[PDB]
Amino acid sequence: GEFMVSIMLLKVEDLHVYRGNREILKGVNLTVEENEIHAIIGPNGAGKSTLAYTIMGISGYKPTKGRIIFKGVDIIDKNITERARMGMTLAWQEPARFEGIKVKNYLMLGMNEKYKKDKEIAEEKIREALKLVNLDPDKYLDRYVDETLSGGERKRIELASIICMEPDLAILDEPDSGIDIVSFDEIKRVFDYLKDKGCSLLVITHREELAEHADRVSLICAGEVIKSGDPKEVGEFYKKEC
Amino acid sequence: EFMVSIMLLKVEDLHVYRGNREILKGVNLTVEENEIHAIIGPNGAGKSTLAYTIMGISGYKPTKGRIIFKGVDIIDKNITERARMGMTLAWQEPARFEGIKVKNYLMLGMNEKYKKDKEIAEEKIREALKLVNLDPDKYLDRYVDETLSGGERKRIELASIICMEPDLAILDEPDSGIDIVSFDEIKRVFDYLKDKGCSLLVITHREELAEHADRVSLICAGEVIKSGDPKEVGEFYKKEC
Numbered sequence: 155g156e157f158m159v160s161i162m163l164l165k166v167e168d169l170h171v172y173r174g175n176r177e178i179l180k181g182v183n184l185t186v187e188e189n190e191i192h193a194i195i196g197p198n199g200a201g202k203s204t205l206a207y208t209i210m211g212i213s214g215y216k217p218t219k220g221r222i223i224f225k226g227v228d229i230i231d232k233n234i235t236e237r238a239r240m241g242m243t244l245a246w247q248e249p250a251r252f253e254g255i256k257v258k259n260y261l262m263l264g265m266n267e268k269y270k271k272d273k274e275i276a277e278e279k280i281r282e283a284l285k286l287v288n289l290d291p292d293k294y295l296d297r298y299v300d301e302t303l304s305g306g307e308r309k310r311i312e313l314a315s316i317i318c319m320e321p322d323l324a325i326l327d328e329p330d331s332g333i334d335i336v337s338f339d340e341i342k343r344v345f346d347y348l349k350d351k352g353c354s355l356l357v358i359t360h361r362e363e364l365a366e367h368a369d370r371v372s373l374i375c376a377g378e379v380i381k382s383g384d385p386k387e388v389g390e391f392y393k394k395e396c
Numbered sequence: 397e398f399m400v401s402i403m404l405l406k407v408e409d410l411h412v413y414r415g416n417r418e419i420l421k422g423v424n425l426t427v428e429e430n431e432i433h434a435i436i437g438p439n440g441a442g443k444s445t446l447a448y449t450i451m452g453i454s455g456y457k458p459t460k461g462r463i464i465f466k467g468v469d470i471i472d473k474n475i476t477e478r479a480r481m482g483m484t485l486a487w488q489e490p491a492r493f494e495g496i497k498v499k500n501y502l503m504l505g506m507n508e509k510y511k512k513d514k515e516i517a518e519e520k521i522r523e524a525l526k527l528v529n530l531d532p533d534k535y536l537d538r539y540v541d542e543t544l545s546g547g548e549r550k551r552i553e554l555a556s557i558i559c560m561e562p563d564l565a566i567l568d569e570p571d572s573g574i575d576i577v578s579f580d581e582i583k584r585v586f587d588y589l590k591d592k593g594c595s596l597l598v599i600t601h602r603e604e605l606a607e608h609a610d611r612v613s614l615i616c617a618g619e620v621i622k623s624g625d626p627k628e629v630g631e632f633y634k635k636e637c
């Protein structure tokens with residue numbers, strides 16, 4: 155291979171986002187490459203979740219200045235459904251509970267077409283995803299994705315949902331939240347498995363254990379990317395300056 | 397010189413069944429007056445279930461054993477009866493009570509020693525926000541709703557505990573959603589609460605916070621496996637679990 159190029163999957167250009175009265179994002183320049191794990195670190199109120207919501211096109215999160223480019227398309231006038239059709243997904247910090255929806259049915263919703271095309275393949279995929287996040291398929295398939303699950307179990311089911319979905323870009327807002335340490339290698343193996351399939355993860359995290367697993371980390375302070383690059387160097391700068 | 401000694405909280409061989417599964421299988425746990433007792437352990441071990449059973453949350457009734465708070469068996473007392481005795485619970489993922497400003501939220505539940513004088517209560521709310529690093533002038537008139545970030549809502553919940561100043565504050569992951577550059581402020585909140593005579597029963601996944609407790613208890617499959625020194629119990633957890 156002669157040329158060494160980099161492909162951009164997502165490009166956030168000088169993004170200014172106003173929430174209510176306050177200016178949360180003040181010119182964010184962020185890129186996500188194809189098959190890359192890009193972690194976003196920073197203090198509370200810096201605008202990390204707001205950045206994820208603006209990329210997903212959550213109602214109310216429209217930029218006043220700048221633009222979001224996904225797969226070379228300017229997605230500014232596209233609703234959350236139009237962005238999800240292109241291969242983008244968001245995992246919330248506290249995922250929704252649903253009465254009456256079983257775990258098997260929830261993991262089937264959003265499953266990649268390459269698995270849905272054959273019933274037996276889709277059933278094996280759900281079992282594989284639960285085993286990846288350390289949940290016994292025979293104990294959790296019949297459970298409901300409701301208030302009965304513990305936060306850690308719900309967070310693992312959300313991660314299994316991403317495996318089945320196999321999206322082009324998975325934005326994960328604190329995928330570690332509520333999950334015990336000891337289970338942190340399983341989270342890294344999920345990220346590795348997703349990278350192996352061609353996925354790109356944009357992970358917001360407070361765990362250095364997970365942020366150091368990314369290929370690139372970006373520090374965000376007061377709606378601005380302060381530093382970006384090596385996970386350990388950017389992490390050390392965070393723990394000392396901003 | 398008064399020999400009458402009363403244990404703040406005493407959980408005796410507690411067996412709790414949730415749905416079909418037996419979550420707690422004989423829990424023996426005690427909380428002393430003016431003590432920070434951390435509870436560590438893997439997911440599904442029953443730590444949150446233990447906190448909900450102590451608070452008397454609807455559906456969390458024990459099949460065997462008993463819960464004794466301030467020498468009183470609270471088994472037949474509802475969550476409101478337990479809260480009047482000085483017990484409180486800070487849920488992991490707190491409620492967004494819309495149409496209620498942060499000033500009203502912090503005033504609901506405030507300790508009587510502060511409510512008795514309007515000026516004292518107004519200074520208490522400002523003090524609590526400053527303790528959790530929130531600027532009172534920026535957050536006092538804000539609404540507790542989805543507008544607040546998880547870290548901000550978790551800090552407001554901690555400020556609420558300062559104003560309340562309870563005898564026993566059960567905190568289910570008080571660190572969750574809070575950045576690591578603010579973990580000293582969480583420890584200073586625990587110190588401030590201990591200084592006032594409060595006892596905290598903190599469930600946590602951060603060794604940073606669990607090592608700040610006077611005693612840590614490891615729970616595995618509804619059972620206390622080890623208890624005592626925070627560093628020794630913490631090392632045993634990473635090793636065997």
Ligand SMILES: Nc1ncnc2c1ncn2[C@@H]1O[C@H](COP(=O)(O)OP(N)(=O)O)[C@@H](O)[C@H]1O
Binds near residue numbers: 200
């Ligand atoms: N409607 C609104 N009115 C006022 N302030 C608002 C708002 N919606 C959001 N905010 C504020 O904007 C900031 C955005 O925080 P967030 O993007 O969640 O920060 P983070 N996840 O990186 O911790 C927070 O300080 C939040 O309270």
Ligand SMILES: Nc1ncnc2c1ncn2[C@@H]1O[C@H](COP(=O)(O)OP(N)(=O)O)[C@@H](O)[C@H]1O
Binds near residue numbers: 303305307438440
């Ligand atoms: N109604 C229910 N049916 C079945 N299982 C139930 C249940 N309510 C709770 N559980 C289970 O109880 C277990 C205890 O979870 P929890 O007490 O939150 O554990 P933890 N805080 O230490 O992470 C979990 O594995 C959960 O799935």
Ligand SMILES: [Zn+2]
Binds near residue numbers: 409421422
């Ligand atoms: Zn027993």
